[model samples]
Target: QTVTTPLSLTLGHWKDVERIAHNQSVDVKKRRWVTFCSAEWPTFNVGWPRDGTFNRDLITQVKIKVFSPGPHGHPDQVPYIVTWEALAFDPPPWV
Candidate 1:
C-alpha cells in the first residue's frame, strides 16, 4: 500500500529557514527520501501565528513555526520556540 506521510518542522530564522526548507523539499521530492543534519535550527522567535505559503506538488508536507509566550507575557514581546522535523513522503514501499 502507498501511504502519504506528511512532515511538519519548526525552523529558526526567516530567510535561511525558507531557503533550506525549499531546497530540502525539492531534494526530497526528487530523490524520494534524503537525510540531513544541521548544526543549529534557529534561536530567534518572531511572534504568534506567522504566515507563509508552500507548493502542494513539490512538497506534500506541512511545516509550522509559532512563537508563544508563557503566562507571564504577550506573544508580541516574549516568545518561545517549538519545532518538528521531517520532509516530504518516504521512499516507495518496495524501496
Candidate 2:
C-alpha cells in the first residue's frame, strides 16, 4: 500500500512451526526463531534440496530465522529459507 518497493510476506501460517518458538519475540511483525537442545541441535529441518552433503548425516534442526520472502528479489536471490547459527559458551571468550 506504500513505498516503491514491491512486496511479499512471511505468512508463517503454520502453527506447527510456531509451537516450538520459545523466545516469544518477532520481527517484520511475524517472524520468529527456534530453540535448541543441550547438544546444540535445532528441531527444524534445514538442508539443501539436492546436495547430499547437507542433506546427509549433517542433519537435524532447532532454531531458524523465518521470513515470507521479498518478491522484489531477482532470480539470483531468495530471502526465504535462510539459516543462522546460535553459538553458546559457558563463559564469554573475551577477545
Among residues 3 or more apart in sequence or in different chains, the pairs in candidate 1 whose N, CA or C atoms overlap within 3 Å are: 9-84
Cα-lDDT of candidate 1 = 0.24
Give one digit per residue, the lDDT tens place, for model 1 in 24-67. 44222211111111211122232212222123232212223223
List per-prediction Cα lDDT, in the order shown: 0.24, 0.22
lDDT of 2 by residue, 1-95 (tens): 43221111112223322322222232111232211211113322443222112222332222222322454222221111222111111111210
CA RMSD, predictions in order:
13.3, 16.7
Alpha-carbon error at 71 in model 2, in Å?
Answer: 27
Look at candidate 2 and tell me the lDDT of residue 61. 26
In model 1, the runs with Cα more than 4 Å from the true position are 1-12, 26-95
Ten contiguous residues with the weakest lDDT in model 1: 32-41
TM-score of each: 0.17, 0.18
Clashes of 1: 1
